[PDB]
């Protein structure tokens, strides 16, 4: 161990940079992010695929599968001219004999980046503090930095207006999952009007709220509160996540219905409630009935599918983002890359066996 | 909707077969020479097996690759198909086009019909609609001596698989002359001679016997798959034996009894022994390994096709392209963090 | 004989392992610096693993993609090798779907079954036998760490520990290039005389060495001290502190060991590693430690070991420029003017 402290980030390195938490980024930073991750969008949207990953190799680390983030990956990094490498949960070991020290350290030597969906948060700080190499989280069960920054892109496509943001309302709906959590983080970020709505028993805690006070103190922002058919109202952003519990203490069936089924769940009434033009959001996969009414999820107002896509439209582009500041910070010797070329070709011109 | 998919060849007329295996074959040769035609750069295909295909799966991941682009590989368990709806729909976010081997036929074509990009049927319960093809150029490439394809005779034997009725669905197609024997129990049933017969309405083909010995004379393609069930009533070891080991088994006597120079094939895998003997299928007139790299000769056309066809129907604004690429240059140029 | 197989050392000579050595290093200086040599364009790798071998794949994955290639992972289950469908069904086919072969075999014979049935190169990503994939790589690493007017030639390589093969295949290599090999480690867990005998033939034609049981000695004036970790061959998988009973007496790599063999004897391992095993933290994370650079070269080989079959392949096996113009022109006619 650093014999330190280290709970939640991981140390900065003084070359390379993470991505493990928007807690590390700034407000104009993240605009930096969504600016770039949209511009590519653009061009990519009309046929020009943008080759800035050209020969990159990206490993990606999943100890619990998830196809929309793997093809997620896998994709971003052919359209920019690299390759998504697929470590199956069972494939890696990340700390199953071998220390996080020793497959950081060997996992720098072969892959360009690295993105991983780990279990405990834990330890996907342990390794983006032990690699040389920027380190993407895929989601822990602290949070979904990868989907902060999907959604910010999503609405800001979708102010409709003179709303510019800052000012927009966005409620989530249900239990205070990571995707929940990260929502709030990354509002506040953004100096907007953050809420949390749900039941006694599962709202975002203090230690929680203290962090996203924090950003409030910085951003002009806001949160939360527990009766529902109320903080609904004026809100331009509608978003619930799923009702199981924590991937281990999960599905009881009905047990979930008898907490949430009362209010929670989003119907056409609840849409109403909120606005004439909320539109509604879900990060998926989405149980329908549960959470969400068909009309709502299939309706009019629902970008929950765009949003979906830009999952995508924002992994592209972080991932340009880390690389590009990789290469600031160890930039190639064009010189010595002359040679190292020419050495090569005339070995290859030359020589045989 | 402006898009095509690629769920079963009985959407498709035989000329457009025809441009098929002409598309197929013309990038065969290119490559088979070393150009490698870049015709999907970029492009992202996903596969969905719902059962592990390996022949299928690197075809798929390979042909991609020669093109330009990639294949994803979602396992067996790594997808779902969360209504159909919602994963179809999603799905055409994040990829250019999509294969499925699904277990039931229906799901595939659910896909087909509720994705906005080309949904390609990697083989159902139904049909194997991509071997269909891949055969198809073997055959053509197989003709020997001013037989013309439309007068050759197709014949398979054993089991009513889904190879074996796809078989006999695209050499019908294309105005050939179909049998499948077999064992009184396991014929294609009434059902299925219904499209074959509708088929050759049109093409001018035929079908279908009960007695062996006999049907495969004058064959110039005698065709084979295993005896197993429905990998679900995979039947039986020696039950299969039971009913297909009198005749059923494709050994020399079998092959000389259909022709000098009939030339073998078999979709493969092969168990040796069973319905085919070894001296058979390590022939000189086996073309079951060609045939099987037809699988990718085809595949990769196929790709290339609903690609080309979706970009039609589909095409990009060079104005807001050449634009989008400016702003992009710019911003990466000026702009940092 | 119109293609060339990597299934082990003992068909390369000295001279062709040092090519193979240089046009890695070349390679990984060109990458090193910016430049990815696109050897492989379009080029499909098939990797078929019995094992799962993360280390092993995303090397090879991460070769095809620097150099223009792909790499296509047959999981363990994926492939069948022998399953039902025999080798020489499976070698036949799988050679019209791509254009080289690697497989993490489980039995030995099966992975030369392969390379003798294929018609495409086959590459040995390990077996129960040897590790050749290893041997290249950690010769690469060797050459870059020389210290001082020691010209390799003249070097002594050290391996403590259980006879695996990562063991047999580190003295088949060593041995292949004149150098000083031994293997110090338990009577009972010694390189069998069948495998000393394949070392000696390669002595006799190099100027080498090997071998010895008693340690503490045997360490002395080591240019490289080697090992890998105590467990069985995963089937007789050991015994939890069977293993400590029999090597945790000497055969754990600490730094007395380190200093009893040389100042600035450098230390290496395959990994993974048991850390307060077969090596002591202080060891593995000192100064002295290149066990992660030779963990790189696992990659700087196979970049250039993939390079070489292709290569080799081509010439043999090389395109009608003619034909291939043709057609080109052929396929774009065809693309210009037909249509459904």
Redesign the interface.
């Known amino acids: 161990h650093h014999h330190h402290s280290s709970g939640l980030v991981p140390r900065g390195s003084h070359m390379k940079r993470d991505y493990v938490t928007t807690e590390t980024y700034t407000k ?2 993240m605009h ?1 992010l969504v ?2 991750s949209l ?2 969008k ?2 990519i ?6 080759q800035l990953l ?4 990206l ?1 990606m680390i999943f100890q619990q ?1 998830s ?2 983030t ?3 990956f ?2 971003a ?3 920019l ?3 998504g ?4 949960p ?4 990340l700390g199953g ?3 996080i020290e ?1 497959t950081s ?3 720098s ?3 360009d980046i690295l993105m991983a969906r780990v279990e405990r948060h834990h330890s996907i700080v342990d390794l983006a503090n032990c690699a040389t190499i920027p380190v993407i989280n895929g989601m822990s069960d602290y949070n979904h930095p990868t989907q902060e920054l999907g959604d910010l892109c999503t609405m800001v496509e979708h102010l409709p207006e003179g709303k510019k943001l800052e000012d927009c309302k966005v409620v989530f709906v249900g239990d205070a999952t990571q995707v929940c959590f990260s929502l709030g983080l990354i509002t506040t970020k953004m100096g907007m009007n953050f809420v949390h709505f749900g039941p006694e028993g599962f709202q975002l805690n203090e230690e929680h709220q203290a962090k996203l006070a924090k950003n409030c103190e910085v951003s002009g922002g806001s949160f939360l509160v527990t009766d529902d058919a109320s903080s609904v109202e004026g809100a331009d952003f509608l978003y619930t996540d799923v009702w199981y519990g924590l991937y281990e203490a999960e599905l009881s069936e009905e047990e979930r219905m008898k907490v949430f089924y009362p209010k929670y769940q989003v119907n056409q009434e609840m849409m109403d409630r909120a606005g004439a033009n909320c539109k509604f959001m879900h990060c ?3 149980t ?1 009935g549960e959470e969400v009414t068909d009309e709502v999820i299939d309706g009019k107002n629902s970008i929950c ?1 765009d949003e ?2 830009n ?2 439209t924002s992994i592209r582009g972080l991932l340009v ?1 880390l690389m590009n500041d990789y290469e600031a910070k160890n930039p ?3 010189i ?2 002359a040679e ?2 020419k ?2 070709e005339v ?1 290859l011109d030359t ?3």
């Open positions: 104009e930073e930096y600016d770039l511009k590519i653009e061009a949207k009309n046929g020009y695929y943008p050209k020969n990159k190799s490993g599968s196809t929309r793997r093809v997620s896998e994709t990094m052919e359209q001219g690299g390759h490498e697929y470590l199956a069972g494939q890696i070991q004999h071998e220390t020793d350290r060997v996992l030597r072969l892959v998926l996969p989405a329908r599918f979906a896509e999952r995508l983002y190639y010797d064009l010595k890359q190292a070329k050495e090569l070995f020589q045989s066996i």
